[PDB]
Design a protein around this ligand. Structure first.
Ligand SMILES: Cn1ccc2ccc(-c3cc(Nc4cnccc4C(=O)NC4CCOCC4)cc4nccnc34)cc21
Ligand SMILES: O=P(O)(O)OC[C@H]1O[C@](O)(CO)[C@@H](O)[C@@H]1O
Length: 431
């Protein structure tokens, strides 16, 4: 016999591959940490457990505050010993994360600019049975380097007792400390056997060598879709709909009278925002489409943006679900991310179908996504680096636009309520 597990609905028989170390490579202020973080955010959200080990954070913990670039001098015998021990301590943690804590990918975020340092990470990987994948960021444009420094270096803890001008100055010399011994990845000759991507001039061009597995090709694909241009992402739900007024889930009802006032308000908001080339996306459910109709803009529908499928519970109230399917109600409340409605979906299923939405979102600039409660949560979690456990409980009120702006290494979210009443469909984590 086979039995169907209670939360996920997976048929199982009755009782009766290598982790990867991703090695960042490059001079300081080349976006290594920007990429480390963003990538880790994508990987975790698609369900590959990933963690960043930034050697700089180890050095900052092992050493009294930073005073100047002299700490990074190649003739600094003692700082060198410290730096090397910081790398080894980060690797100890990498071993722990991947071999014992269920980690899948560890991103070793450091300059790792010498063949020697990289050879040692390889030895580490090889003897723990970890795959190694290198990502190098190369850029010689001073404008880009300057910008990076202004944007994330001068505000860092290292420079808290320095003004801008002198953080910038210190950082420039800090970089020059690494230049003499920098051996770029060389896939033609000495690195022909390594798996790596060398990125040149901020994603303009890539060198890819020996992709070993699906995580690696997928990272390359991700890296070819992202960009660093400023832009804005607006996320909202459909205007209130008739099923909302009844506390009924799922279905494909139309906008209520308030829902229509929202749409009209949303149109005003969008106009006042004054964007160029704002793309608009909806699901294929009517609520969403009517809402976009009020904007008088071109929009495109995506079945992927359709609300979670409640299967056999579609169109019931939560009340009716507790009465009719008491046991299914409880299972969901106890594990709301992995719980699969019977005949239906989990939040986990949602991530899989939203993955192509995220990938296209990364390619776009200004976008307005009009969608549904659970879908919105799933997208929002991606942008705000929220865990699978939290995602089902993020708050996405009706008639409220969430305005997301890339800033520094992450994302500012700004809530904008359009002053139209609605019922509340938020349901707290109960225990
Ligand atoms: C699009 N893409 C694909 C691969 C890849 C690798 C590195 C980078 C990359 C990204 C990058 N980005 C930042 C680094 N530090 C701080 C901030 C950014 C950054 O993206 N800032 C932007 C945020 C959005 O608004 C405009 C400014 C800087 C780089 N500098 C030199 C070389 N590469 C850089 C971009 C990449
Ligand atoms: O995961 P939760 O909190 O039940 O929210 C999902 C529900 O939200 C709604 O969008 C609105 O109630 C339903 O269509 C859907 O079943």
């Amino acid at each position: 016999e086979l039995t169907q597990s209670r939360v996920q609905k997976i048929w199982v028989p009755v009782d009766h591959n290598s982790p990867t170390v991703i090695v960042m490579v490059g001079l300081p202020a080349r976006g290594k940490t920007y990429i480390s973080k963003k990538l880790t955010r994508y990987l975790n959200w698609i369900g590959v457990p990933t963690k960043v080990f930034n050697v700089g954070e180890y050095r900052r913990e092992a050493v009294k505050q930073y005073s100047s670039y002299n700490f990074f001098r190649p003739d600094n015998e003692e700082a060198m010993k410290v730096r090397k021990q910081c790398a080894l301590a980060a690797l100890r943690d990498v071993k722990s994360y991947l071999a014992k804590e269920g980690g899948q990918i560890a991103v070793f975020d450091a300059t790792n600019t010498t063949r020697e340092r990289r050879h040692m990470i390889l030895h580490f990987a090889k003897e723990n049975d970890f795959k190694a994948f290198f990502i190098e960021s190369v850029c010689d444009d001073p404008t880009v380097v300057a910008s990076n420094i202004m944007e994330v270096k001068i505000s860092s803890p290292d420079y808290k007792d320095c003004n801008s001008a002198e953080a910038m100055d210190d950082f420039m010399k800090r970089i020059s400390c690494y230049e003499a011994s920098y051996q770029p990845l060389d896939p033609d000759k000495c690195d022909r056997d390594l798996s790596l991507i060398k990125v040149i001039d901020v994603g303009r061009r890539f060198l890819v060598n020996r992709v070993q597995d699906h995580i690696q090709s997928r990272i390359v694909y991700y890296l070819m879709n992202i960009h660093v241009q400023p832009r804005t992402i607006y996320l909202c739900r459909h205007g209130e709909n008739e099923h909302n007024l009844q506390g009924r889930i799922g279905g494909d009802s139309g906008l209520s009278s308030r829902g229509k006032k929202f749409a009209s308000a949303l149109s005003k908001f969008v106009e006042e925002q004054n964007l160029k080339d704002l793309r608009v996306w909806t699901s294929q459910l009517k609520s969403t489409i009517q809402t976009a109709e009020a904007l008088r803009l071109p929009y495109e529908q995506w079945k992927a943006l359709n609300e979670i499928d409640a299967g056999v519970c579609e169109e019931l109230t939560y009340e009716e679900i507790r009465d009719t399917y008491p046991e299914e109600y409880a299972l969901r409340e106890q594990d709301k991310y992995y719980y699969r409605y019977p005949t239906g979906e989990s939040y986990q299923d949602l991530v899989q179908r939203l993955e192509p939405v995220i990938m296209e979102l990364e390619r776009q600039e200004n976008v307005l996504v009009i969608c549904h409660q659970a879908v919105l949560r799933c997208l929002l979690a991606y942008f705000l680096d929220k865990s699978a456990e939290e995602m089902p409980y993020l708050k996405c009120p009706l008639h409220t636009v969430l305005k997301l702006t890339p800033v520094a290494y992450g994302c500012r979210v700004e809530s904008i309520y359009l002053n139209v009443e609605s019922v509340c469909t938020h349901r707290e984590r109960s225990e």
